[PDB]
Write a protein that binds this ligand. Structure first.
Ligand SMILES: [Mg+2]
Ligand SMILES: [Mg+2]
Length: 958
RNA sequence: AUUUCUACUGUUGUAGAUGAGGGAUCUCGCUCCUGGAAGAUGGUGAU
RNA sequence: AUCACCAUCUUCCAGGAGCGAGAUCCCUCCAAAA
RNA sequence: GGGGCUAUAGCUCAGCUGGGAGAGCGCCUGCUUUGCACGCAGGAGGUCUGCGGUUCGAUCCCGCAUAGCUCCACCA
């Protein structure tokens, strides 16, 4: 669909021949070398108009409600500071030249601190309940004597444990500490955090006020820095092309003036196997900066002239109309003076801009930008030495791996644009792909952790990197977001969604999240909607015409020996077994052998649904098992973190002990885990004898017992972290326990128990079961958690989640293209949008839940096609997602969202049938998911897509 | 073995993804500095 | 046996700064002619 | 534990409309038969679930806490 301008930051490597921290910066355009800071003068007035507060409206900045008694006290406390003509602000800003101001954020901090300080001295010195109630601690008063004493029970016990001086046996001292830090100090804090009603409220009133100030502080902070960033440009830059390779030439501004005066005299003869280059351009934004920039000071020379064309002065004079601006600017270029200082193709701009008429201000910007961007050429011989000698020009060479290899065709996308920029087919489109005129250079040191241990490498020696920015679709409308109001974004999305049409959409996907199968995919079409049950069943059955083709590895253990005597396994890297060129080269097999292997190892078939847990794109084929290793790194990092964050990381010795087991031994552990898996309220009501039967339910095989159904109704209601923990489970679980005593003895006290890891069958292809050695390695207590060292394992939970998404975006984008070039139309991505409360729960039951990342990486992908708008603040528009509405739909471009209510338990053909039916609809209709769907779990994604498509078309009807 | 990441990895490297820099608020884990309170123990002086 | 003082030293609380992990958020990336 | 409903005197409950705190049962007392007592009479009983806000005026509108049932969304 019609696109809009898009930017990206692509980089390469520079090789130095003549001469992280930003060692240098430069701009291609010769006129930006002496930039001046932007005119932010308008915004500063607005934010200054938002800092100031008037007391009386304070309590309207938060949802928290305070009674009148506290209401009067807090205002009274603040007023005591406003004497002597002070004025009130929402926060302290070290800018804007303000004086005699009182920071509301600071004052709220002070009263909270003093009260918490006073209440600590009171409780420790032994005063009584009725003595507290008469004091001025209006925040901590009114707590029940149930809480007041409960706090003091810990306090005396804590101070009573401060007699560790008397101990002269470290073996016994280390046992003392754990009984102090964990059981007492960490428990007293929670009591005050979640049970003091008035205290909790003020813990939220202060936070929101701290966040509101934070919002308008960073906004102002970025305004200050810009005035420092514009100073650092130093060099005009050139690109000298030679034998198909580019060189990078710098030149300081002490010489840039003379060099251009010399270079412009050289012959633009044509093509002679060597060229020098230099860019020229003007743009709409730069024109306003020239006419109305810094006008109030009166030093804007473009306002010393040109005044005749003015409407009165200032941009606002045009009353916001579009066409009046157009005519004024045309007159600016139509005036003689402007044509005497500017450098533009007068005859073409005269013929194409000044005399024309535009229907909107957008087209005027494009026409101006379109025509003023030029790429000159001077091709005189032996133009290298003069720059080095006369112009003291530093020189580099632009190089990268793809730019050095021999074979072509396969090349990385960020190298696909650079080589596509210089082509002649692009120069005839007025540079649809554009190289913007500011660049920068960095220099990274080698990693000392790599030099010491050492294999060709990058980190083993320093590197010069070039960071550039390139715009695609340069001749489409531009869209920017800086300083929009958080309520204008919701309006921007609403307008952008008018592009799509009821008839344009031809299909839709559907994605379902989970924990046994991290993501499942399906597809739906309007053709599946026949009227009768017989036709509906028959139409879906034609999988050959609708579905997609997928490979499946047959024997994950299959390996081979290669041309160097080394051994290679299929599961580590299939792409050495699918690409014909690779198999022949490496294993030295013949053409007949390669076809024999392919026919034997890789099954194939066509299906409607798929599993995104392990699918990847290899040499043009979808391999459902091509990504096993990258899932192992996710069930490892989750395990390596849980057994590191359940230790105690004091700087001082402690006796906490933690050990791994495949099963649980005593009734203390089994009862402690069953409490960890159940609802606290519902579990507590369970009888003390019934609790042990409930343990037999979880940890033994139900087949060899007689749990009565009435008892099942309880065991099925007390459970909230679902799973299967028996010894005969499909993916047996691995356990970890914590205690202080040396040996269990079936009597020892135990503090926690937690499931860590899941033993998936496929993982045995990579690592043997004896590789819990590598899971265990990442737990310790001697490591204080404020050091980065050999134990650098924590860092990679985020980075390891983007690996799985990197493999689920290729598949989703590969299928999207496939169908668009077969049905001839765009389509919708659909996924349940269950708000943010359901998302946090999801991450709670598994650190590796991929929901929020898998969304934020779909917006990044489909913007390039112009299908979704630019996204400023996602949570502003789509928090508290749909719920309890089987018709609504939320839409950001083509990425819709729907209610997941009842999806996974309905037959695609019927409305009454349920799942868990053994692939045949229990209502006795003809549906059979035997060889339509990858698995019975695929019905959810199919239903999610099915519902999504109908809701969207329904909305467009009216 | 890579502009960068992930899995591999040296007879031309292979397969997927890739907008970077700097900064703000909050939650959890930890360290150093300054101040306040409760308290063991040696010693000293009055009683 | 009461009260005062020096000293080793134990715990808890407040404020300042710094390191590791997670969540939300913001700006910059095209201007000048003597 | 991620969305919804009710809660009036000791018990059961009418009343919930912004201009209005009540009924039956239970209890105490007096009356009283020979005797249970059919019966007569009066009294005690309220933080309108607890807390808080809005309003000229609130059991009535608005926001939190506890007690009861509902959803394969997360899964032997
Ligand atoms: Mg779902
Ligand atoms: Mg599912």
């Amino acid at each position: 669909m019609e696109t809009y301008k898009v930017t990206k930051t692509i980089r390469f490597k520079l090789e130095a021949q003549n001469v992280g921290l930003p060692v240098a910066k430069a701009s291609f355009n010769y006129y930006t070398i002496n930039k001046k800071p932007v005119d932010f003068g308008n915004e500063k007035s607005e934010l200054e108009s938002r800092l100031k507060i008037s007391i009386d409206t304070i309590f309207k900045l938060t949802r928290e409600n305070f009674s009148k008694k506290i209401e009067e006290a807090i205002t009274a406390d603040i007023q005591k500071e406003l004497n002597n003509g002070k004025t009130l602000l929402l926060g302290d800003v070290p800018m804007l030249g303000i004086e005699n101001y009182v920071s509301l954020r600071q004052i709220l901090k002070n009263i909270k601190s003093n009260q918490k300080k006073a209440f600590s001295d009171l409780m420790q010195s032994g005063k009584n309940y009725n003595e507290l109630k008469a004091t001025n601690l209006y925040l901590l008063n009114t707590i029940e004597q149930r809480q007041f004493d409960n706090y003091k029970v810990k306090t005396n016990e804590l101070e009573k444990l401060a007699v560790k001086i008397n101990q002269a046996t470290n073996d016994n001292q280390k046992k003392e500490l754990i009984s102090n830090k964990q059981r007492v100090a960490k428990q007293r804090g929670i009591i005050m955090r979640d049970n003091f009603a008035t205290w909790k409220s003020f813990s939220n009133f202060y936070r929101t006020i701290s966040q509101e100030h934070g919002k308008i502080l960073a906004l102002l902070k970025g305004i200050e820095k810009e005035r420092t960033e514009s100073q650092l440009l130093k060099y005009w830059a050139l690109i000298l092309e030679n034998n198909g390779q580019h060189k990078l030439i710098l030149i300081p501004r002490e010489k840039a003036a003379s060099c251009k005066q010399w270079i412009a005299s050289l012959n633009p003869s044509g093509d002679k196997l060597t060229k020098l280059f230099w860019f020229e351009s003007l743009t709409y934004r730069s024109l306003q900066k020239l006419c109305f920039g810094f006008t109030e000071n009166g030093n804007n020379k473009f306002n010393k002239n040109i005044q005749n064309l003015l409407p009165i002065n200032g941009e606002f004079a045009f009353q916001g109309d579009e066409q009046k601006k157009i005519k004024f600017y045309q007159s600016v270029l139509e005036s003689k003076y402007a044509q005497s200082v500017l450098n533009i193709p007068i005859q073409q701009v005269q013929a194409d801009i000044i005399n024309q008429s535009f229907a909107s201000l957008d087209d005027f910007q494009i026409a101006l930008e379109k025509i003023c961007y030029r790429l000159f050429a001077v091709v005189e011989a032996n133009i290298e030495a003069e720059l080095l000698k006369n112009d003291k020009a530093q020189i580099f060479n632009i190089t990268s791996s793809d730019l050095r290899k021999e074979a072509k065709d396969k090349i990385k996308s960020h190298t696909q644009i650079w080589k596509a920029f210089w082509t002649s087919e692009n120069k005839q489109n007025n540079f649809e792909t554009r190289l913007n005129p500011e660049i920068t250079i960095t220099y990274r040191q080698p990693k000392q952790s790599k030099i010491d241990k050492y294999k060709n490498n990058r980190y083993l020696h320093a590197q010069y990197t070039l960071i550039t920015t390139i715009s695609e679709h340069s001749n489409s409308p531009t869209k920017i977001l800086s300083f929009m109001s958080d309520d204008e974004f919701k309006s921007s999305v609403d307008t952008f969604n008018k592009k799509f049409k009821k008839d344009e959409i031809k299909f839709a996907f559907g994605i379902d999240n989970g924990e046994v199968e991290l993501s499942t995919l399906g597809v739906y079409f309007p053709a599946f909607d026949k009227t009768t049950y017989k036709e509906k069943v028959a139409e879906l059955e034609k999988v050959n015409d609708y579905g997609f083709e997928v490979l499946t590895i047959r024997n994950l253990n299959y390996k081979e020996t290669d041309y160097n005597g080394k051994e290679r396994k299929i599961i580590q890297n299939p792409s050495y077994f699918l690409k014909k060129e690779n198999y022949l080269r490496t294993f030295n097999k013949s053409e007949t052998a390669y076809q024999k292997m392919f026919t034997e190892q890789f099954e194939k078939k066509k299906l409607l649904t798929l599993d995104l847990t392990t699918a990847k794109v290899i040499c043009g084929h979808i391999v459902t098992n091509g990504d096993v290793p990258a899932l192992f790194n996710l069930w490892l990092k989750h395990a390596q973190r849980n057994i590191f964050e359940m230790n105690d990381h004091i700087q001082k010795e402690t006796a906490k002990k933690i050990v791994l087991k495949n099963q649980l031994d005593t009734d203390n552990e089994k009862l402690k885990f069953a409490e960890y898996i159940s609802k606290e309220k519902e579990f507590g009501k369970l009888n003390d004898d019934e609790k042990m039967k409930y343990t037999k339910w979880i940890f033994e095989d139900r087949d060899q017992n007689n749990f009565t159904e009435v008892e099942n109704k309880k065991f099925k209601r007390c459970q909230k972290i679902y799973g299967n923990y028996s010894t005969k489970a499909k993916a047996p679980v691995l356990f970890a326990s914590c205690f202080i005593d040396e040996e269990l003895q079936s009597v020892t006290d135990i503090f926690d128990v937690r499931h860590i890891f899941k033993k998936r069958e496929d993982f045995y292809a990579l690592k043997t079961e004896e590789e819990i050695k590598q899971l265990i390695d990442s737990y310790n207590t001697n490591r204080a958690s404020h050091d980065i060292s050999n134990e650098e394992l924590d860092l990679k939970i985020l980075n390891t989640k983007k690996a799985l998404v990197a493999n689920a975006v290729g598949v989703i984008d590969f299928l999207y293209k496939h169908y668009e070039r077969r049905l001839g139309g765009e389509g919708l991505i659909i996924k349940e949008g269950f708000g943010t409360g359901k998302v946090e729960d999801g991450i709670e039951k598994f650190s590796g839940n991929i929901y929020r990342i898998l969304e934020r990486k779909l917006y990044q992908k489909f913007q390039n096609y112009g299908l979704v708008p630019p996204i400023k603040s996602l949570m502003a528009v789509r928090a508290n997602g749909i719920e309890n509405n089987k018709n609504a739909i939320l839409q950001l471009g083509n990425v819709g969202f729907i209610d997941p209510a009842g999806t996974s338990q309905e037959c695609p053909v019927c409305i009454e049938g349920r799942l868990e039916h053994t692939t045949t609809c229990p209502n006795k209709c003809g549906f059979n998911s035997e060889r339509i769907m990858h698995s019975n779990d695929g019905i959810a994604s199919f239903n999610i897509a099915k519902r999504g498509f109908n809701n969207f078309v329904k909305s467009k009807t009216d």
